[PDB]
């Protein structure tokens, strides 16, 4: 029986909900403290035990690494020359992203309002902009904004109501008369609060999202499976950060279509609020042991980005197709981590560290280590995700009734660049999975 | 589809035939930009640039619930959405092609961008070229341009006859809300320079700038089909966006390399000429590469680089005698543009590029159908056998970046076909 996503999606919807258990512990969580930005863990040696700024001591390893003709921590490349290209890949690849996560809101691609952009100016005269919806039926909007989404490059799609627990308390963010060269040194943190305003809107106290912001849109961006099972090597950077620019692009190209459709919307790419939970409110997949969402298809091997906006829609229904079981007895991503990052014990409420966001239950893993890993290696790892059974693409059977988890799966570079590639990196021998028609962008 | 290629490979050589008349052309000739051709009537008789009567249109058309020239929507949501989204396809292109050359994302140098500063400390960009061998680098090259979005990707040597001989542009400091009024001619010259580089009076290509790596980016068939309605803007718009991340990903990539390299999208030379010289396909009728992947459904961008290179064999797979006898485009576009005569080596009007073997078509009579019908036609390349409702469409198959996973196949690539 051939794959069919569509149906795998159906016989394992759920009934409407927030899928995530929380508890009384449970406040939103500040931007400033996840491993890249925390002052705790923003500092790591380099390969000579100068401790810098973690990106920057990961520098001196790539540097390192492409002198001694290697693609990543102790594995010998080709020759130089791969070496090299590998990492020009990888750098290429962030082209359409600011500073690792285009995290700062209203700042250089992710602006709130579209008024300034050359797009907006150059179709002022049509007024797309002003005129007031000429659609406010939820259901033909659902239709159109996947469509749309679709278009701009995602290859998951899916809404959910907004819950704002997963929206950070603060944003880090920079001033907004520092211009880009001085980003780096000028970060700081901004409160995103909620009030009664018409629109999108930062004074310079404030990040102001309207209370009647009340859904979110959250994108998936499949990577490439070839270049993920390289990780911790160049070419997992390379796909990783290609995907940061398709990010970019898609918020930018998706907020457009959504004010010239008559309503507002935000981008965030890696900024705003947490990526994994919206994504398992909108069903997308489920919370995994390494903490990202699983998808059906793509595994974890995908990345989040997601859209806020007032344009009503119908949200999507959470999806459970059994990952907390298979997680529970699993552990493969907790024994390969490098750096032993991700618990090998249950779930619990309690954040490990600053990092985590305590009062939801989910694996709490040591952000920290995993950050400490990138300059030791000179990459994003990844091995988690490339070790992952869901990552592998043959994962589902059909027994003559219905879908279910192979369990069989739980028990060189210079080959990738000889080897088979497409279009974004995509899979054509999958990409029959995220065809979409409209019975399944709306119901 | 990689086996359909090399059957039709040609002999190297570029299978342009021209005469001693043939000039390299100004870009302001091209009908979007000559004063002959810029202004045009809005419905209500009122002369204004082209793109702002067809603006004018396009609202008519919203306000009476219409996809396109008397062709009704659904209702005005349908309406709306079909220009919402045209509109939306365009957020990453400058003006309608980016043709200004080195200026906002068509930067001939790396410098100043935000991802080099950035990864300054690595010094990719200054660090000399590791490798040098024209085969390894022409299947690292064209791996990066597929995951830049490249449908199709080919490599010639850079024929200059096809560079403009001026281009359009704005002044260097001059605000992008005052571009529109501001454009200025500007000469592209070839010097014994190390970099690319622009004084006040010159774009100027080094003489090592050896190659052209030409990119196809696939439009999507069933939105294409709705010409010259509004989804057949969108699709357009959105690969216009898709051209301009391409050619700003390959540049860095090339420089990250040890090269330089120059983006162009719309700008700097005529993409046809190179697609062609690249092997993506054939000159047609109507005047677009046809490829046999994606017939002319398809756009073109391209890069400039010393980068060394194994250049494509152009291919021959039977356009030029399938267009002799079709017609059909012809027939069908709404403007007459298009000439049912054999090909010559004389240009219809200033648009044309005269002393080259070609159909030559009046482009002002195509430009002057886009106001009256609020959109950029497509008609000829929606009817052209090679590339075989809007509610329809809306309610229909879609997949990622409009891609069709019952042809995408086609596109797979091993190192056997890339070099
Ligand atoms: O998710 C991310 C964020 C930063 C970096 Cl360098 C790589 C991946
Ligand atoms: O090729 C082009 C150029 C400009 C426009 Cl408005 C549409 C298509
Ligand atoms: S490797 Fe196993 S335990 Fe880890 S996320 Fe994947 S399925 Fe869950
Ligand atoms: S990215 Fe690497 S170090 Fe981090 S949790 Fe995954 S396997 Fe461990
Ligand atoms: S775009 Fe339309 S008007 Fe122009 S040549 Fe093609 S069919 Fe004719
Ligand atoms: S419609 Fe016919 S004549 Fe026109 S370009 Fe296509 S094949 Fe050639």
């Given amino acids: 029986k051939e794959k069919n996503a569509a149906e795998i999606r159906q016989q394992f919807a759920m009934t409407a909900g927030s899928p995530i258990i929380v508890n009384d512990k449970l406040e939103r969580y500040a931007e400033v403290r996840t491993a890249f930005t925390h002052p705790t863990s923003f500092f790591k040696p380099n390969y000579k035990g100068e401790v810098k700024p973690w990106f920057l001591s990961a520098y001196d390893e790539k540097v390192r690494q492409i002198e001694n003709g290697e693609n990543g921590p102790k594995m010998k490349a080709k020759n130089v020359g791969e070496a090299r290209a590998g990492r020009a890949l990888e750098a290429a690849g962030w082209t359409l992203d600011i500073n690792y996560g285009n995290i700062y809101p209203n ?3 992710m602006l709130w309002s579209g008024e300034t952009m050359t797009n907006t100016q150059l179709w002022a005269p049509v007024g797309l902009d002003r005129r007031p919806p000429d659609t406010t039926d939820p259901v033909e909007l659902t239709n159109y904004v996947k469509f749309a989404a ?60 309207p209370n009647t912001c009340e859904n979110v849109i959250v994108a998936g961006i499949a990577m490439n499976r070839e270049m993920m099972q390289t990780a911790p090597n160049s070419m997992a950077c390379a796909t990783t950060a290609f995907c940061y620019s398709r990010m970019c692009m898609f918020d930018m190209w998706l907020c457009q279509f959504i004010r010239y459709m008559g309503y507002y919307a935000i981008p965030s790419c890696n900024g705003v609020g947490q990526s994994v939970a919206f994504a398992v409110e909108a069903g997308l997949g489920q919370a995994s042991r390494m903490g990202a969402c699983i ?56 954040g490990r560290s600053i990092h985590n ?51 069989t799966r739980f028990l060189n ?3 990738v660049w000889d080897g088979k590639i497409n279009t974004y990196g995509l899979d054509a021998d999958h990409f029959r999975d995220t065809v979409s028609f409209r019975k399944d962008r709306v119901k």
């Fill in 150 to 209: 679709r278009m701009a490059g995602a290859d998951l799609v899916g809404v959910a109501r907004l819950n704002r627990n997963w929206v950070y308390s603060e944003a880090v963010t920079i001033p907004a008369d520092v211009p880009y060269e001085q980003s780096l040194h000028k970060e700081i943190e901004k409160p995103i609060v909620f009030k009664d305003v018409p629109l999108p809107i930062e004074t310079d106290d404030e990040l102001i999202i």
């Fill in 295 to 350: 998808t059906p298809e793509f595994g974890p091997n995908v990345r989040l980005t997601k859209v806020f906006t007032n344009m009503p829609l119908v949200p999507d229904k959470p999806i459970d197709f059994g990952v907390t079981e298979f997680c529970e007895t699993c552990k493969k991503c907790a024994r390969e981590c490098p750096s032993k990052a991700i618990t090998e014990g249950p779930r619990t409420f309690e």
């Fill in 357 to 407: 966001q305590s009062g939801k239950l989910q694996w709490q893993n040591d952000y920290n280590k995993c950050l400490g890993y990138w300059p030791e290696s000179g990459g994003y790892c990844g091995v988690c995700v490339a070790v992952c059974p869901f990552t592998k693409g043959n994962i589902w059977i059909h027994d003559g009734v219905e879908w279910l988890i192979d369990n």
């Fill in 413 to 415: 570079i210079t080959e």
């Fill in 107 to 109: 700042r250089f691609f």
